[PDB]
Design an enzyme around this catalytic site. Structure first.
Site, PDB file in Angstrom:
ATOM      1  CG  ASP A  27      -1.146 -10.037   4.096  1.00  0.00           C
ATOM      2  OD1 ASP A  27      -1.084  -8.853   3.842  1.00  0.00           O
ATOM      3  OD2 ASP A  27      -1.483 -10.858   3.165  1.00  0.00           O
ATOM      4  CG  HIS A 232      -2.086  -6.835   0.683  1.00  0.00           C
ATOM      5  ND1 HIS A 232      -1.457  -8.239   1.273  1.00  0.00           N
ATOM      6  CD2 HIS A 232      -2.075  -7.280  -0.719  1.00  0.00           C
ATOM      7  CE1 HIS A 232      -1.203  -9.060   0.037  1.00  0.00           C
ATOM      8  NE2 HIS A 232      -1.725  -8.407  -0.896  1.00  0.00           N
ATOM      9  CB  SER A 397      -3.723 -11.595  -8.817  1.00  0.00           C
ATOM     10  OG  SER A 397      -2.423 -10.891  -9.287  1.00  0.00           O
TER      11      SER A 397
END
Lengths: 1217, 304
Positions: A27, A232, A397
């Protein structure tokens, strides 16, 4: 939270909290210090066991060793007593900024607590005269005006100043100690002293609002800093794991350990890089091989591809799943609604990754950034979405994380109940266990919603089944597709497909104890629906087996229809389906094309059609585009009565699939506002003979049930002749054979907007990388092919740089790397790109740049095929060249009557474009050496049809390209001598020079040349302040030697000033100034006897240089004597005589002015000058002088900033890769 | 999409009344993507989106046979012609725009010369003249062409040639629009460069597995051609300064369909491109002297 839908009851195996299992987080990086990731449920053990930045963006070149002979980078050094195991005696050092490890959306990190002292700006105003013409104070107002400009100029520039710190590290015993100069000034031991995160100094040290971690590779040759700054990556880990000890805000598996792995490159800010991923998998593979298995990966990250059947990155993913048994979780994508929009991760070369769609329960009603989950047809035919959960940066999501944590829970007991499993048996178990949600889009999910406690049941049972260790490779029709997907295509006939099904033993077929040859695999196949047909039996016991399946589309009515062939183990038919063969058929509406434009209206029910929308409704109509159709017009309005003037908001996703091209190559996603009153109209580009999906959803309404009345009208008009849209400048007049679709007002327009040049590789070195870092197990060394390039801007313009053969592909490419970095003339970094860089435009100033291109791979002989790969540089043209059209050829060749707009029905119209004239090209100021011009060709007159129906056009350029006398010998001999006196030892030149002048007295040029020599052997070339400042202190040498070296300077400038007067007197300027400005009579009555400027302009070009060199010489002397004041008179009378000719800003005199300005105390003007130079040259010397200018002005907040530019704008080495 | 006339007549028979049984079968297969048939050497890998008509065994072949170079006008003098001969009544003097060109053969080869803007039109043209004459280095005449000269190939020996182009008309200001008109010289290549095809992009970029012939029914097949390597170009002994290579692209496998179903293809090239000592002065001074003794009056040179 929201954890109940998937399970909250498998936690009734409370000892399955996530024990003995570590997840991997690919990520934007994570943050351990953040509440939740501090410790695992143990309440003591650290959860974020490791953390890397695989992009290479955090690398630092610790290559330069220097012994701490401090006593016994850029600025100074002070730091000892810390000889703690600093064996054997030395230390490593390098410089690095950190504006990239930081999300580029944090420029607010630039706070002016002590930077806004600029505001104290003294605008000395004008109680003098009224208009522009005072003498001689015009220089004063200049100076003043220029200071104010300078100050404002720095204000506009502040935020651009990136600061680079000093880094130090040495090999102690406790591992490795690294030091970051936080307090730039005091080099004292009062800064960041971080240790290797891996070797358990797993602690964040801070600069401010910016935490840092550190790794070390290549025996200490590289420093890797790791940046937490990227939200994130943190939340993703907060959903998967997150010990809060409350089962209320906790993650899904608080006992699971996390390893953050930034796969985003700060330079691309912040995209994924082939390299990044390869390194991530490499690490994972390494850790697993070495006892520390990582069981799950989670990618909330990814893009789309142009194919699935091929790719190196993907093939490596299939190796980390098949060889290292890692369960790889990845988000299906956030690119909905229009189906066939699942992006890579998970759309690769096989179903080895668990794709996770996202759904929002009705329990969460809520209202730019919305993003539907991508729908799962999957463009290979296969199935990307494996399940769904509540919830480049695939937002996910955040439910992929959820699932990831869920997968951790299962693997908790799967291992502590001692159960033999696979990454297949797990994905298989969850699939045939999930709950299909009848209120969620069938495509948006896949095997409905994850059910953990039920999926664990499946695993506990059937645990003694060998099917758990078997993978079933399903590839279709020789292209190895993973699904059947009929979408051409008017499906009126049935078709047969040859599917190849092959059993594959988990790891591979190697003895001890594997693979137990011939595991008798007999299975039956059941079609999901009647229109799909195939055998009911198939024996795989003896390897790969082919099977035919027939699809009958004949009965299917327009729209999308899905079906699947589930296969079961003949024996235990209760194991659920082992695998599936995904069939999905699209039957397009056909539109009759005769009377007026073809139009599509939904079917009418009870009079008026008007489709009904709800918070769920997703209307997807599939239409086969009419031939000749270039673009489309979408009209829609809300029907249901009243509602007033309020507006509704609908989401329109158009999507066409082109031959072996990503879904992002013919797609539109526009949020359209619709009203009840009048009809709304949006338009989009269209392709003739291919199916188009018109997907319409409901955004936000103010209501909860509307009725839409919409239609699609198809228009078109274009050139049909073969190689239109491409025109060679030397092939004569170009023609366009234009045919329109059922009448269109044709009125073409062609604007050549940017000129592109081709950059060939100067060098192509193939080199092995690190043996420590870049080596994929086991023994696969990764090599790099480094390609060098030269770009050369002459006039400032917006430029994009791209590599044709590599651009367009990120995943699905044969090579695992692109990344080019544009470097300054000073080795600075100007720009840096990767895939899809043809769109990014970095604005460059004139000067020579360098470009480096790095291509990684493990097979060297494949990198060699890349060695000739060129680049392309697209210069945005200031003035877009507009091309005219003609209807009659003969009228075109002569450029008379132009084409006159008119309607065109069912006929063919031929237009012509004549080659661009030579004059109009040089006035376009094209680059060197331009290859072609590019722009967009438009056909229709309809203004809206013009903004959308654009055709890429390209205009390629054609390639470019007496018996001497003793007297003649005399002229030839002086020139030979003069050419020498400048490059000789000045003691030899003084002799030569004498002989020249004695022989050729009038030859003044000999004077200037001796000067250039004298000032090249004796005195350094430095600007006013830099010269002054450099006439003080510096005691390393002798206090005596400091005179013999500075008395040599005096003698020289003296000798230099006199050499000028010799070229000043016998060159009387008075009369010399009666032809230049006193020209008037062009070519002096064209007497063609004095029509020679060569002599005049020569006598002056020599003059200016004399005056120029003299002043700058008589100004240095003044500084040596310290008396610029009682000498200022001459400098003035001298400077005022030069200006009478070419102005001061010309190279000829540009830096005699700098002295004049200095002697007048016009520090403002000096700035105005030293910028001119900084526009052409740009040397450190310019900045140190531009800094000194500020110091003398008092602004030390400014000079502190200038000292930062330098540090970064003039690096020691090129930035690493 | 256009009407075709199949006209059949009787030549000579030995008879005087026959009965013919004939049929026309339509076949096809080609590239549909926009700018196929034209490939720039610096735009990366080229693709061909091939769709066939109801099944065809597709097996492409591309041979770059001749290399063409662009000749720009060195001069463009507009001059009035004769007042005796070339004057159309009443008082319409006919002027000529004389364009000069330089061609330069390095290695002997068959060459065709043509003027794009004028070739293709004989009548129905705005101007009443083309005619170019290729001249020797000695002012001799080597060749001479007019409309449709792109087909005639005059074989030239190495050396520098001249080309003159004369364009007649009565309105001078129209001849001026012609002043930049270039020429084209097509050199027949001894060794036609043969290009390979690939079915998988990634296989193309590395030049591995080539495309394997196979039938193609109602689907779209995408093939790729990777840019020509630098080595294979210099060994092709191209002219100076070549602009593009041209040849014919063929799709169908059927050998007879190959001789007829030819598509003009073009491959465009990318542009080309210490403090001296009294001793050092000694070496610099001899060279300066030597450079002189060859161009001097030999009585001065004998001294030097």
């Amino acid at each position: 939270k929201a954890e109940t839908g998937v399970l909250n009851f498998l936690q009734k195996y409370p000892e399955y909290d996530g024990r003995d299992v570590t997840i991997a987080i690919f990520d934007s990086g994570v943050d351990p210090r953040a509440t939740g990731l501090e410790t695992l449920c143990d309440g003591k053990t650290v959860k974020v066991i490791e953390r890397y930045d695989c992009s290479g963006c955090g690398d630092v070149d610790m290559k330069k060793k220097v012994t701490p002979d401090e006593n016994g980078e850029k600025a100074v050094r002070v730091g000892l007593k810390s000889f703690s195991d600093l064996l054997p005696s030395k230390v490593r050092n390098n410089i690095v900024a950190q504006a990239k490890l930081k999300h580029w959306d944090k420029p607010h990190k630039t706070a002016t607590a002590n930077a806004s002292r600029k505001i104290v700006e003294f605008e000395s105003q004008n109680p003098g005269e009224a208009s522009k013409l005072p003498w001689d104070k015009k220089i004063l107002k200049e100076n003043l005006d220029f200071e104010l400009e300078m100050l404002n100029s720095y204000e506009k520039v502040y935020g651009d100043i990136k600061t680079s710190y000093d880094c130090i590290l040495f090999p102690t015993a406790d591992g490795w100690l690294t030091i970051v100069d936080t307090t730039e000034q005091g080099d004292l031991d009062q800064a960041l002293r971080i240790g290797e995160y891996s070797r358990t100094h797993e602690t964040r040290n801070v600069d401010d609002f910016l935490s840092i971690s550190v790794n070390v590779h290549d025996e200490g040759n590289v420093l890797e800093v790791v940046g937490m700054s990227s939200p994130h990556g943190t939340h993703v880990s907060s959903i998967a794991s997150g010990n809060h000890s409350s089962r209320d805000v906790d993650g899904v598996a608080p006992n699971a350990k996390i390893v953050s792995m930034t796969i985003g490159d700060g330079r691309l800010g912040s995209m994924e890089t082939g390299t990044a991923l390869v390194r991530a998998m490499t690490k994972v593979m390494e850790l697993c091989r070495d006892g520390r298995r990582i069981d799950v990966i989670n990618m909330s990250y990814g893009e789309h591809a142009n194919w699935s059947n091929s790719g190196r990155i993907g093939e490596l993913m299939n190796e980390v799943v098949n060889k290292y048994g890692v369960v790889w979780v990845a988000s299906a994508g956030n690119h909905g609604p229009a189906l066939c929009t699942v992006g890579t991760p998970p759309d690769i070369s096989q179903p080895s990754l668990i794709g996770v769609g996202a759904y929002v329960s009705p329990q969460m009603m809520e209202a730019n950034v919305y993003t539907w989950t991508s729908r799962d047809p999957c463009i290979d035919g296969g199935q990307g979405v494996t399940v769904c959960a509540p919830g480049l940066m695939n937002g996910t999501s955040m439910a992929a994380p959820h699932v990831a944590g869920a997968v951790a829970l299962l693997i908790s007991g799967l291992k502590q109940q001692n159960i033999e499993y696979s990454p297949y048996s797990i994905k298989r178990a969850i699939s045939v266990t999930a709950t299909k949600l009848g209120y969620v889009d069938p495509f948006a999910q896949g095997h409905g919603l994850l059910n953990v406690e039920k999926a664990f049941e499946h695993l506990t049972e059937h645990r003694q089944s060998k099917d758990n260790m078997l993978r079933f490779s399903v590839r279709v029709g020789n292209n190895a597709d993973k699904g059947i997907h009929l979408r051409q295509g008017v499906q009126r006939n049935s078709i047969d497909y040859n599917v190849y099904i092959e059993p594959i033993f988990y790891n591979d077929k190697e003895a001890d104890p594997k693979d137990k040859f011939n595991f008798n695999v007999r299975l039956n196949l059941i079609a999901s629906q009647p229109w799909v047909q195939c055998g009911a039996f198939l024996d795989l016991s003896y390897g790969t087996r082919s099977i035919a399946v027939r699809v009958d589309p004949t009965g299917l009515q327009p729209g999308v229809h899905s079906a699947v062939i589930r296969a079961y183990d003949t024996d235990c038919v209760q194991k659920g389906s082992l695998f599936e063969i995904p069939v999905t058929v699209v039957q397009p509406h056909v539109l009759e094309s005769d009377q007026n434009t073809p139009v599509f209206e939904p079917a009418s029910s009870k009079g008026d059609n008007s489709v009904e929308f709800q918070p769920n409704t997703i209307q997807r109509d599939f239409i086969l585009v009419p031939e000749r159709a270039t673009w489309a017009e979408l009209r829609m309005r809300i029907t249901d009565p009243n509602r007033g003037e309020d507006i509704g908001k609908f989401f329109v996703h158009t999507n066409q699939l082109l031959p072996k091209q990503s879904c992002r190559k013919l797609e539109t996603m526009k949020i359209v506002s619709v009203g009840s009153e009048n009809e709304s109209i949006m338009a989009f580009k269209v392709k003739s003979g291919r199916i188009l999906e018109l997907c319409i959803a409901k955004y936000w309404s103010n209501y909860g049930q509307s009725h839409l009345k919409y239609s699609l009208r198809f228009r078109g008009v274009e050139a049909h002749n073969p190689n239109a849209y491409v025109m060679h400048a030397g092939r004569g007049i170009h023609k366009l054979e234009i045919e329109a679709l059922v009448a269109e007002d044709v009125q073409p327009q062609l604007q050549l907007k940017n000129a592109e040049v081709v950059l060939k590789p100067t060098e192509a070195k193939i080199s092995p990388l690190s043996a420590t870092r870049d080596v994929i197990p086991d023994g696969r060394q990764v090599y790099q092919n480094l390609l060098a390039f030269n770009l050369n801007v002459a006039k400032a313009a917006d430029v994009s740089i791209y590599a044709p053969i590599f651009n367009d592909l990120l995943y699905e490419a044969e090579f695992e790397s692109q990344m080019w970095m544009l470097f300054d003339a000073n080795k600075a970094l100007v720009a840096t790109g990767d895939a899809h860089s043809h769109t990014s435009f970095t604005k460059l100033d004139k000067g020579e740049y360098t470009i480096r291109l790095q291509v990684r791979h493990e097979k060297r002989d494949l990198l060699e095929k890349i060695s000739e790969a060129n680049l392309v540089a697209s210069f945005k043209l200031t003035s877009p060249l507009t091309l005219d059209f003609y209807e009659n050829y003969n009228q075109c060749i002569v450029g008379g009557r132009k084409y006159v707009s008119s309607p065109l029905r069912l006929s063919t119209r031929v237009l012509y474009i004549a080659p661009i004239t030579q004059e109009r090209l040089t006035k376009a100021n094209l680059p060197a050496q331009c290859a072609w011009l590019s722009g967009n060709l438009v056909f229709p007159q309809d203004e809206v049809g013009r903004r959308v129906a654009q055709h890429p056009f390209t205009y390629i350029l054609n390639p470019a390209e007496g018996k001497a006398n003793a007297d003649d010998y005399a002229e030839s001999f002086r020139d030979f001598q003069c050419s020498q006196i400048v490059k000789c030892e000045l003691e030899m030149a003084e002799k030569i020079y004498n002989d020249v002048v004695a022989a050729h007295p009038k030859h003044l040029q000999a004077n200037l040349l001796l000067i250039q020599n004298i000032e090249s052997n004796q005195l350094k070339s430095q600007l006013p302040l830099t010269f002054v400042n450099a006439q003080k202190t510096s005691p390393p040498e002798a206090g005596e030697s400091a005179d013999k070296q500075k008395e040599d300077q005096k003698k020289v400038r003296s000798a230099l000033e006199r050499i000028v007067k010799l070229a000043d007197k016998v060159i009387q300027e008075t009369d010399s100034e009666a032809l230049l400005s006193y020209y008037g009579l062009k070519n002096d009555t064209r007497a063609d006897a004095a029509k020679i400027k060569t002599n005049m302009d020569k006598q002056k070009n020599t003059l200016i240089e004399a005056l120029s060199k003299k002043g700058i010489a008589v100004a240095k002397l003044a500084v040596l004597d310290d008396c610029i004041k009682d000498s200022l008179a001459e400098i003035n009378e001298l400077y005022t005589e030069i200006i009478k000719f070419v102005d001061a800003n010309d190279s000829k005199a540009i830096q005699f002015a700098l002295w004049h300005a200095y002697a007048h105390g016009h520090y403002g003007r000096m700035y105005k000058y030293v910028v001119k130079l900084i526009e052409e040259k740009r040397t450190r010397d310019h900045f140190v002088e531009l800094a000194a200018i500020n110091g003398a002005l008092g602004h030390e907040h400014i000079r502190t900033v200038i000292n930062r530019m330098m540090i970064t704008a003039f690096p020691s080495s090129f930035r690493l890769f």
